[model samples]
Target: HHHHHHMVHITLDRNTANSWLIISKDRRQVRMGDTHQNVSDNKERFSNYPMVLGAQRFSSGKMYWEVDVTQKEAWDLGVCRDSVQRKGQFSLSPENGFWTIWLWQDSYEAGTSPQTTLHIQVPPCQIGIFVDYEAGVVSFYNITDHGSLIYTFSECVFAGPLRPFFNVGFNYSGGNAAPLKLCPL
Candidate 1:
């Protein structure tokens, strides 16, 4: 099937970034910081989520964004409502305000109820996310080839404005060194 998306440029919100995250000077890339910085204890800051939020928020519209995960073995990307819990260990599911897809331990999983295990024909170097708030859908695409549908959360209820969400994880193993970059399209 053919799919075309109107991409949007997103940058990292330093205030919402985790203390252990290293954001690029351009604010389009983020990775697990080698060392933690003493950031203030802000409620919006993710203490244990190992993730960051985009500076822009969308209340209504069809918005899209992409992240370059090339050479990385672990990462998560998706959208979350402004009300999503930022503290403690919370579930990454639509019900919990986080609709995300992740590549971890060489496996791909969509953050849905009974989280789907995706059998990707080819590992994706980049991912595309499209949010249609009025239509109540949040779709994930493996942009490795045109745009392969990875997953979509349909009938999604957004309590508030939604923002781009990301996580490179905390495992400083072989794959944590490389950053996950938000591509400008």
Candidate 2:
């Protein structure tokens, strides 16, 4: 039971178009902008982010999904923050494991823009997660601890067309990204 408080946060650009995030009762997908290599892990991570169900897009449309992220192994998962994207990392345990969510631009040009790093921990307890794109923030709360702010990052937005990806990992730079079995609301 070492789910400490270590976590990561990401942000997206101000304007992202022609894309949307799709999440279902048990699955999710992102197919908007292009995918890119993460500067943090130098692996196959999306450049943008993903919008979730009940979001403005789905609320105005009809969408369903079927994907698996509960493998007993690690995987790379991410959401497009507008056109920028990043992957989320997770271990194979049900609880009490480390997780990382990566967010970066889907398209990278000539020079390499540095990636920011933020570290925090979870308390081995399940929590509710929410993100506000207009404010460029993602937050997690404890389930048992009255859903306190376990982790918060102001690096990315939850804008539409943000593609959410769940790879087997975002790992390569000593640490990889992985899929997560998030506690549903």
Candidate 3:
């Protein structure tokens, strides 16, 4: 019921994407690039994972955004510290500066170190994420189910600005090629 207009517009940050990840020309969709593309060194690029960050960041306040995960089988969407380690492998959890949830092989799970399984009716095609900065909370809602609560992370210690996190797992088998799209305001 507190789903007010904390809505914000965000675009995928190409500079922060992995060499094997492709950011659409419009900067709203992210998918596998298949080939490495000979990307040069960059401080923002994810050196080890097929991931990307959003252009916008939240410092202190309520923020909201929606993502179109339609037709995708494996994906991870959430928020992470702008300064999170991007050079190598790191666990996706609040301790590692990541507060997220993911879909793996048709099952949903929280991105915590020991991934927590989620039980819901039908998975959402379009998902909404809300962040209560000051309150130290992050939540995901299923827009497909009238904004029903999907999951929430509270007691978070947001030390600094956080950026929207996007990950479309490696589609080596070509089973998950659909792009994860950022919804408009």
Candidate 4:
């Protein structure tokens, strides 16, 4: 009920994406580049994370966004502080400024301090994320069938501007060729 009115507009930021990650011409979808492009070295480019940041930043507000991960076998999505680590294999936990949920081969987990395995009978093709920055809560919903709760991270503290974050996994080949799309609202 709290998330009923906080929809946000999100688009992928190509400037913040890793060189090996391909950003669509519209900058709303991200996938593993067919071949690594020779991009100049920059601190913003993800050096260790196979992820991209959203073009918009939220300093304080109730926010919501949806992601389509239908064809991808492995992926992660959530919100992170703009200043979070962009150069190392960091844990996707609140302590690391990441409040995410991930899907692996045949399982799902909330990227928490001590990660919590989510027992979901049906995997969600489209996932909805709702965040209450002031309330210190982030929730994930399965929007495939009349929106159901997948997981939630409570007691979250936003140290800075929060942006949508996405990753199609590190070994993004074979079954994970599909682009992770930021669904239009």
lDDT of each: 0.85, 0.31, 0.88, 0.85
Candidate 1 lDDT over residue span 38-143, tens digit each: 6777888998857899999999888888889998878889999988888898888878888889988889999887789987998999898988889999888888
Which clashing pairs does model 4 show?
Answer: none
> Candidate 2 has what TM-score?
0.33
Model 2 CA deviation exceeding 4 Å by range:
1-78, 82-122, 155-160, 163-179, 182-184
**lDDT per residue (tens digit) for residues 57-91 in model 2:** 21112121222333212332333322232345322
Candidate 4's TM-score: 0.94
lDDT for model 2: 0.31
Query: If scored against the real structure, what TM-score would every candidate get?
Result: 0.94, 0.33, 0.95, 0.94
Query: Candidate 3: misplaced stretches above 4 Å?
Result: none
Given candidate 3, what's the lDDT at residue 48?
86
Cand. 4 Cα-lDDT = 0.85
| Among all candidates shown, the one with the greatest TM-score | 3
Top-down TM-score ranking: 3, 4, 1, 2
